Design a protein around this motif. Structure first.
Motif, PDB file in Angstrom:
ATOM      1  N   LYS A 195      34.953   8.392  53.763  1.00 31.32           N
ATOM      2  CA  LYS A 195      34.142   8.572  54.966  1.00 31.32           C
ATOM      3  C   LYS A 195      32.672   8.835  54.630  1.00 31.32           C
ATOM      4  N   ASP A 196      32.418   9.876  53.836  1.00 33.74           N
ATOM      5  CA  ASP A 196      31.055  10.242  53.453  1.00 33.74           C
ATOM      6  C   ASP A 196      30.363   9.216  52.561  1.00 33.74           C
ATOM      7  N   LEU A 197      31.131   8.566  51.687  1.00 31.53           N
ATOM      8  CA  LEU A 197      30.594   7.549  50.780  1.00 31.53           C
ATOM      9  C   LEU A 197      30.131   6.288  51.510  1.00 31.53           C
ATOM     10  N   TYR A 200      36.414  19.560  46.733  1.00 29.85           N
ATOM     11  CA  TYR A 200      36.392  18.399  45.838  1.00 29.85           C
ATOM     12  C   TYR A 200      36.609  18.907  44.423  1.00 29.85           C
ATOM     13  N   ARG A 239      38.805  11.251  53.343  1.00 31.03           N
ATOM     14  CA  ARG A 239      37.703  12.202  53.474  1.00 31.03           C
ATOM     15  C   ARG A 239      36.542  11.815  52.554  1.00 31.03           C
ATOM     16  N   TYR A 240      36.875  11.405  51.327  1.00 34.29           N
ATOM     17  CA  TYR A 240      35.880  10.966  50.344  1.00 34.29           C
ATOM     18  C   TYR A 240      35.225   9.677  50.827  1.00 34.29           C
ATOM     19  N   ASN A 290      25.542  13.330  54.862  1.00 36.18           N
ATOM     20  CA  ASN A 290      26.354  12.759  55.929  1.00 36.18           C
ATOM     21  C   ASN A 290      26.892  13.784  56.920  1.00 36.18           C
ATOM     22  N   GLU A 315      29.578   5.990  54.927  1.00 37.16           N
ATOM     23  CA  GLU A 315      28.593   6.331  55.956  1.00 37.16           C
ATOM     24  C   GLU A 315      27.204   6.706  55.475  1.00 37.16           C
ATOM     25  N   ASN A 316      27.114   7.265  54.273  1.00 39.58           N
ATOM     26  CA  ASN A 316      25.817   7.653  53.744  1.00 39.58           C
ATOM     27  C   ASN A 316      25.141   6.560  52.917  1.00 39.58           C
ATOM     28  N   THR A 327      36.874  14.447  59.354  1.00 41.03           N
ATOM     29  CA  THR A 327      37.769  14.758  58.242  1.00 41.03           C
ATOM     30  C   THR A 327      37.602  16.185  57.730  1.00 41.03           C
ATOM     31  N   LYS A 328      38.638  17.006  57.905  1.00 43.47           N
ATOM     32  CA  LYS A 328      38.602  18.403  57.467  1.00 43.47           C
ATOM     33  C   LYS A 328      39.830  18.830  56.671  1.00 43.47           C
ATOM     34  N   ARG A 364      25.945  13.551  42.470  1.00 44.50           N
ATOM     35  CA  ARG A 364      26.289  12.311  43.174  1.00 44.50           C
ATOM     36  C   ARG A 364      27.209  12.606  44.360  1.00 44.50           C
ATOM     37  N   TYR A 365      28.175  13.497  44.136  1.00 47.53           N
ATOM     38  CA  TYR A 365      29.106  13.928  45.182  1.00 47.53           C
ATOM     39  C   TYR A 365      28.337  14.703  46.246  1.00 47.53           C
ATOM     40  N   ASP A 414      26.023  12.790  48.991  1.00 51.25           N
ATOM     41  CA  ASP A 414      26.708  12.181  50.132  1.00 51.25           C
ATOM     42  C   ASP A 414      27.305  13.198  51.100  1.00 51.25           C
ATOM     43  N   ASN A 428      35.633  22.000  52.980  1.00 50.71           N
ATOM     44  CA  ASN A 428      36.051  20.726  52.380  1.00 50.71           C
ATOM     45  C   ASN A 428      35.843  20.820  50.867  1.00 50.71           C
ATOM     46  N   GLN A 466      36.024  14.756  33.711  1.00 47.63           N
ATOM     47  CA  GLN A 466      34.939  13.786  33.736  1.00 47.63           C
ATOM     48  C   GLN A 466      33.945  14.053  32.609  1.00 47.63           C
ATOM     49  N   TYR A 496      35.057   7.697  41.541  1.00 48.78           N
ATOM     50  CA  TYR A 496      35.545   9.015  41.949  1.00 48.78           C
ATOM     51  C   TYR A 496      37.004   9.095  41.513  1.00 48.78           C
ATOM     52  N   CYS A 497      37.329  10.089  40.691  1.00 53.48           N
ATOM     53  CA  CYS A 497      38.704  10.261  40.229  1.00 53.48           C
ATOM     54  C   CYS A 497      39.291  11.532  40.808  1.00 53.48           C
ATOM     55  N   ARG A 546      28.946   9.929  65.707  1.00 52.84           N
ATOM     56  CA  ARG A 546      28.431   9.694  64.354  1.00 52.84           C
ATOM     57  C   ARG A 546      26.969  10.137  64.217  1.00 52.84           C
ATOM     58  N   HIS A 602      31.806   1.323  45.573  1.00 57.02           N
ATOM     59  CA  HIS A 602      32.453   2.605  45.261  1.00 57.02           C
ATOM     60  C   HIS A 602      33.957   2.445  45.039  1.00 57.02           C
TER      61      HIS A 602
END
Lengths: 395, 405
Positions: B188-190, A160, B185-186, A183, B192-193, B255-256, A175-176, A179, A158, A165, B170-171, A11, B139
């Motif tokens: 994880k980053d949310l 998204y 995957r979403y 991270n 951890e950060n 996560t990939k 916002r996305y 993070d 990765n 929205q 998050y939608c 981590r 979240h």
């Protein structure tokens, strides 16, 4: 295989050190120019509604006070003649709108992405994350897949996909990205906001008077950004640090702004009073974003730089009045609303681009109009407010 | 715990950007600490599905197309599925039970408020297991391929649950069968950060968005009708678990997401005036299996771990996209017949519930592991992988580390 005690070491090695930073901005819009002065004439002709004279002077009055000078669209009058169902009021039209928007939105988005990656200067192979955003068209595989394919990115990027929205989405992407970049060590996030308003275009009617505000407001456009933590000195150009990002829902205001995807395409609904709801609650969102990071809010809001979503002239006027801002504070937002209209999620990216370009041209101290701290604001359906706290860096 | 109020994690007094970042980020790995599931009440047994479907769709006259579908249903390895409709409910909508009559509006009217409602049912169970107040959820990650609206499904779920007005939403719309992996995957980053962050993940699906009559020119739509079922799964994910309060189960290490080149026309769905149109070309189980090992090698190498010589050393949560996908992925990775037992049990009792399937399997795995008194929640094993497969073809590879019981 490593032990239970080695999971934390993985981590530590995986996460980035610093704050997510905007290091490139690229923008794009379709070629067909539609001036606002002649919009009432062009729209009523294209929708074969020239016989409704009393509804025309009502729409012309709305267009005249929008403070929008021109808008860009992926269609001209000749293109619209091929789709008579889109130019009508309630005839089945989703299939045709999807046929245009599904491949069209990622194509326009890719144009903005190309400009952002070219400015950034590093190989496209270094893009690890893609955040695509649109309220125009939905498909499986999604618009993110299509954009990555058109740009020719790595298979393991990765992705998204931020669908439907609305007008706050330009804030959501930040916002996305925050993070994702923070991270993941070495991560470089490509953010793409693209919109094609033909998904909501239709003929005027007496029962749908609030549709007239949408047709006088929305324009097509795309904005793209490269965001990442730990900027490489001498290679990358760090501009804005994304310090705090918060989404807020204003209670009991669902009936104010709402859109539905039907067999007739996107149906826009706006009640009288949206600029008041947004302006009366914006200060509370600002105090919240500052308190979340322990910074005392400034006594004077003029001490910060601003990137407010140009949802309309009235929204900008009322937010300006509530925060007691001088007219020059929203200059960048006002110029974008005039030159391009409301390009949905793409508007804030255009304003951020305009701000840093003018700051560099005037030789100011920082990319954020010479000021240290600022806020990017997204407003839309909910009512939802996206508050993005930014720290600008020197030139 | 997160240590939100501790001095070492306190925010700087001056506006120090890096100091704020150090205090704002979490310390540890994103961990699954609660799983809740839900499904609608109407039970549709698979052995009588061909009879029920052909009667409900006014197609019982197409005898040779019925005997073809009866053979597909017998080979699915699905025992029963749950739906938000019965035969009486379908009679109110002749347009949904037809092949190509206008039906999106009716499907949207059911799915827009229905999906968040079903998702909320699963979320209530996840929150109850977790035990901490709902106001502490920072979240919300909502996921569905059934219905789209503005304000979105995440907004509606948050409203029904009574979450805080400041919850970061998050939608995840229309990410199909790989979406159960995407949410991890979403999350994880949310988690951890963000120090103190507690992510509520909700995957909910109502397959009525894709239900239609059979056709001779659209033979591949029959595979979808025999496969998809309704359901919801919800998870609470967060970094730095509070000892004595929270129950940490699976750590989300890497996560990939991967796209298999030249396979866009294999699995594709379009939202039209007739609702969701499902398309599936032949070769999907073999194409997924021939590219899965490379995805696993990528996820292990990305965190500096040497990929195991034997894939049987790991626990597995593969998306049950069909029995053929499960059989061929198992064969390619040289896995023993019981490695995918949890996945096969869920496929049997609930069918393919789209994004909700992997959540159900993760729940089945941890429950069976605890019931047998095993060493860890992941079948007594330390390392494992959650896999999502869908449109693209896209593979979501989620590397998990299970904690002890």
């Amino acid at each position: 295989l490593p032990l239970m005690e080695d999971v934390q070491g993985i981590r530590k090695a995986q996460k980035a050190d610093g704050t997510a930073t905007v290091m490139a901005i690229g923008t794009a819009h379709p070629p067909h120019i539609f001036p606002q002065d002649t919009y009432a004439d062009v729209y009523f002709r294209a929708t074969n509604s020239e016989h409704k004279v009393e509804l025309k002077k009502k729409f012309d009055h709305i267009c005249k006070k929008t403070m929008i000078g021109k808008r860009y669209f992926n269609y001209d009058e000749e293109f619209l003649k091929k789709y008579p169902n889109i130019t009508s009021y309630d005839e089945p039209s989703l299939n045709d709108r999807q046929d245009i928007c599904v491949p069209g939105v990622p194509a326009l988005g890719t144009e903005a992405a190309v400009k952002a990656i070219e400015e950034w200067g590093r190989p496209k192979s270094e893009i690890t994350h893609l955040v695509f955003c649109t309220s125009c068209g939905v498909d499986m595989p999604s618009a993110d897949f299509q954009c990555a394919k058109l740009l020719g990115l790595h298979a393991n990027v990765n992705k998204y996909c931020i669908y439907m929205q609305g007008c706050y989405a330009g804030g959501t992407v930040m916002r996305y990205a925050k993070d994702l970049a923070e991270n993941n060590r070495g991560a470089r996030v490509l953010v793409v906001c693209a919109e094609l308003t033909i998904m909501g275009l239709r003929a005027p009617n007496e029962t749908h008077l609030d549709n007239a505000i949408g047709i006088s407001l929305f324009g097509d456009g795309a904005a793209a950004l490269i965001i990442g933590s730990d900027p490489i000195i001498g290679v990358e150009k760090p501009m804005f640090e994304i310090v705090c990002t918060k989404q807020t829902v204003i209670p009991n205001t669902e009936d104010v702004i709402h859109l539905h995807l039907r067999e007739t395409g996107m149906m826009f609904y706006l009640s009288k009073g949206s600029p008041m709801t947004i302006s009366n609650n914006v200060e509370a969102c600002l105090i919240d974003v500052f308190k979340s990071v322990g910074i005392t809010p400034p006594e004077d809001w003029n001490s910060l730089f601003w990137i407010p979503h140009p949802g309309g002239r009235a929204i900008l006027d009322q937010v300006e009045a509530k925060l007691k801002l001088r007219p020059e504070k929203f200059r960048a937002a006002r110029t974008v609303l005039w030159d391009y209209g409301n390009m949905v999620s793409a508007s804030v990216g255009y304003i951020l681009d305009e701000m840093r370009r003018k700051s560099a041209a005037k030789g100011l101290e920082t990319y954020g109009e010479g000021l240290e701290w600022g806020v990017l604001l997204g407003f839309g359906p909910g009512i939802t407010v996206e508050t993005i706290l930014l720290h600008s860096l020197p030139l």
